[PDB]
Chain A
């Protein structure tokens, strides 16, 4: 899932 992107967004760290």
Chain B
């Protein structure tokens, strides 16, 4: 009877949306993985089989110097104590940035998916673009604690 949202086969449908008031951002949520094909629409779940109720829901997206309304360009402005909202189907969950870190361009472990008691929302936003090697050197990924 109640709502029952589930990443369907419409890899083309936003599974939901995401916004942050302290960062002033509002964008769609497409199904993982954040592979180029998906990143073509919006912040996709850093992982394909992400769960609607995963102990850690990760998401990733490129950044834009000339565009703060991009995937995660205006995030660098948001920080701890930041109230984060996650909208999906007719349900609106909530998270609050509890931890933030960075790592070389290969620490995939950022997907950080272990804490379950207090689920979380692993944010992933790449930046520090290099023009010599033509690639992103530093990686930015914030974790958020479920509060709803």
Contact = CB atoms under 8 A, between A and B. Distances in A.
22 contacts: A1-B46, A1-B60, A1-B103, A1-B105, A1-B106, A1-B107, A1-B108, A1-B111, A1-B126, A1-B141, A2-B33, A2-B35, A2-B46, A2-B60, A2-B124, A3-B39, A3-B46, A3-B62, A3-B71, A3-B72, A3-B124, A3-B125
B14 interface: no
Main secondary structure of the interface of B (DSSP, over half): mixed
B120 to A, nearest CB: 16
B107 to A, nearest CB: 6
Interface of A: 1-4
Given A1-B103, A2-B60, 9 more contacts: A1-B111, A1-B124, A2-B34, A2-B35, A2-B124, A3-B39, A3-B60, A3-B62, A4-B135
Interface string B8-31: 000000000000000000000000
A2 to B, nearest CB: 3
Contacts of A1: 46, 60, 103, 105-108, 110-111, 124, 126, 139, 141
